[PDB]
Amino acid sequence: GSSGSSGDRRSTLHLLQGGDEKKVNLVLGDGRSLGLTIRGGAEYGLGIYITGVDPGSEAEGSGLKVGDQILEVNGRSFLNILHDEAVRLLKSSRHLILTVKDVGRLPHARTTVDETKWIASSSGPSSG
User: Fold this and answer.
1) Which residues, at least 6 apart from 120, have a Cβ–Cβ distance to it below 8 Å?
2) Could you identify which of 21, 48, 75, 82 might form a hypothetical disulfide with 70, taking C-beta atoms 3.0 to 4.6 angstroms apart as the criterion?
3) What range does the domain containing 94 cover?
């Protein structure tokens, strides 16, 4: 492309699309953090979501917002992780690879993809 495009020539560069998963890799230094107000935990029995974003954090720049659901971090299952452990574990490791999913894109659909539009099998007659 020219200014970083994809559908300018035909596709530009390759990319895999398998699921609505998103790996957010962040690199911290000395005294850094994500600044994300996560909620839920194993103690209560709720997943690891986000309901707060710091104005100028590492998670904000990457593209993290409220509503997102953190699946795993640093190769660790964040499905049954304690609340205090999830808040500390995130502000402890250097390379934080938050793998969240797109929770909130489409309002409600069912059939928004079909080039052939329902195929037809089992045929014979072709006169009239």
Assistant:
1) none
2) 48
3) 1-128
